[PDB]
Amino acid sequence: GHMTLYRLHEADLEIPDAWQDQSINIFKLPASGPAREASFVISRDASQGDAPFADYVARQLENAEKQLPGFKLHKRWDINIHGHAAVLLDYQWQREGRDLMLRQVFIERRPAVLITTLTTTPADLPHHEPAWKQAMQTLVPRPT
Amino acid sequence: GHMTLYRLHEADLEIPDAWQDQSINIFKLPASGPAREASFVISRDASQGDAPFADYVARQLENAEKQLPGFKLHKRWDINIHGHAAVLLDYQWQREGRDLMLRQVFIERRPAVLITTLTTTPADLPHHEPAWKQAMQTLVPRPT
């Protein structure tokens, strides 16, 4: 019965290694002036396998580009977060006639890639950018 | 400026206090033989405010009685977890025509009540109970 100590903001507990982790952190960013609410989500992706991280990211981008109606890529930036390889994508797509803007950062880690996703709109992105940037600039991956 | 250090299993980051936390930790307990896969989910509820914890828990029970078809309380347990007030509610309800067995623990904390929920069927509860129990017996709430 192998177990590992799992850390959350409010507690620690021992989780059996056999349990599948699908945890997701979700934060609602309040509306401000003209801008509506947005979301900032931290998710995990255990599917990298032994693929090079660049290839993992290319796969992620392909999926978005081929699956989201109205997809348009605005930015792709290779960046470094505390030694961890990372890629930021800014892209928009159209959901129910409305344009959504995503700023998504993939952060290489084992056993699972850590992804942060800001969901907003093209006009609201500059309004939420300062708060997004302050959170992302303070994100320190834990050693595995 | 106005932020707080937020801890997750894979990282730490500063989160603006204005952001609303909706985070969910999700664990799937593997199927085994005739027992199907169960889920163990950690959620947060910031609606207690300055109300007594007993009243908060009473409201949850009233919500369950009024909103969940087929709701039936098996057993309520008032317990202490490392000095934190907690209530375990074992109950069933009828979701989309079939019965589910829940073991749901509410743990008083600020700024948000920490909730753990085991979801299974009545037939599978005895199989999953040992691992659930053990996990919960290791849960240590983190000081605010």
Side-chain angles (χ1 to χ4, degrees):
Chain A
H2 265 307
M3 290 122 214
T4 291
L5 193 62
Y6 184 85
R7 181 174 82 131
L8 53 148
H9 182 69
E10 302 87 357
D12 299 291
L13 79 167
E14 290 179 355
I15 295 288
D17 298 332
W19 292 10
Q20 189 200 177
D21 177 16
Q22 303 181 334
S23 298
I24 181 166
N25 304 276
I26 302 168
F27 297 94
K28 184 190 178 201
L29 282 68
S32 187
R36 40 162 80 94
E37 54 154 352
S39 64
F40 181 78
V41 174
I42 309 177
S43 60
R44 290 81 168 157
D45 185 350
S47 73
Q48 183 175 353
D50 284 327
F53 185 62
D55 291 354
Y56 165 82
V57 174
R59 177 161 69 75
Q60 301 319 124
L61 168 57
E62 180 82 327
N63 292 354
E65 175 152 31
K66 283 209 171 19
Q67 296 163 14
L68 298 178
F71 179 97
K72 175 179 179 184
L73 183 64
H74 287 66
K75 292 180 187 21
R76 186 196 180 288
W77 290 6
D78 299 341
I79 55 170
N80 162 25
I81 292 171
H82 293 281
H84 295 61
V87 182
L88 177 154
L89 303 180
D90 275 0
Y91 60 92
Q92 76 179 67
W93 69 288
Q94 194 202 276
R95 188 176 165 109
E96 304 172 336
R98 279 319 170 287
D99 288 315
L100 293 181
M101 183 66 92
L102 278 72
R103 172 162 288 181
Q104 190 164 57
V105 186
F106 300 82
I107 307 175
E108 186 173 31
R109 189 180 191 271
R110 300 283 180 181
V113 172
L114 194 67
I115 306 167
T116 70
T117 300
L118 179 69
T119 303
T120 183
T121 70
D124 289 358
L125 176 56
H127 290 281
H128 292 300
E129 174 164 53
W132 171 87
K133 212 188 294 167
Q134 66 197 13
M136 276 311 296
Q137 288 184 330
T138 57
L139 190 161
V140 180
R142 179 166 275 261
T144 179
Chain B
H2 288 173
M3 305 170 78
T4 299
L5 196 49
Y6 183 84
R7 324 311 196 322
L8 52 152
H9 184 57
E10 302 90 346
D12 304 278
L13 76 170
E14 295 184 353
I15 292 292
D17 308 320
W19 292 11
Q20 173 188 319
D21 179 20
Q22 305 183 172
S23 293
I24 304 164
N25 302 280
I26 300 169
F27 301 94
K28 303 304 188 64
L29 285 73
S32 190
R36 311 305 194 185
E37 191 169 83
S39 69
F40 176 66
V41 169
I42 308 173
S43 60
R44 294 88 184 145
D45 185 351
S47 71
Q48 168 175 10
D50 283 334
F53 186 56
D55 292 358
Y56 164 86
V57 176
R59 177 172 54 90
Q60 299 311 307
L61 259 161
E62 190 174 61
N63 288 344
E65 287 162 0
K66 307 340 147 178
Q67 287 171 121
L68 303 177
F71 173 84
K72 190 178 201 169
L73 177 72
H74 291 29
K75 195 171 170 194
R76 166 176 175 157
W77 322 52
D78 291 338
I79 64 178
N80 179 286
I81 294 171
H82 298 277
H84 296 56
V87 175
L88 168 61
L89 298 176
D90 295 333
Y91 65 95
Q92 75 177 68
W93 65 293
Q94 181 188 89
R95 186 181 171 280
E96 278 184 336
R98 70 175 212 134
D99 297 330
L100 291 187
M101 194 53 207
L102 269 67
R103 308 204 74 181
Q104 194 164 60
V105 180
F106 299 81
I107 309 176
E108 193 180 24
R109 187 167 191 285
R110 295 290 176 196
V113 172
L114 191 69
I115 299 176
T116 70
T117 303
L118 177 74
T119 301
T120 190
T121 56
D124 292 347
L125 176 58
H127 175 276
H128 288 301
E129 195 165 330
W132 171 73
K133 185 176 142 195
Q134 173 62 24
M136 280 304 303
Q137 284 186 329
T138 66
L139 193 153
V140 184
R142 186 178 277 85
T144 303

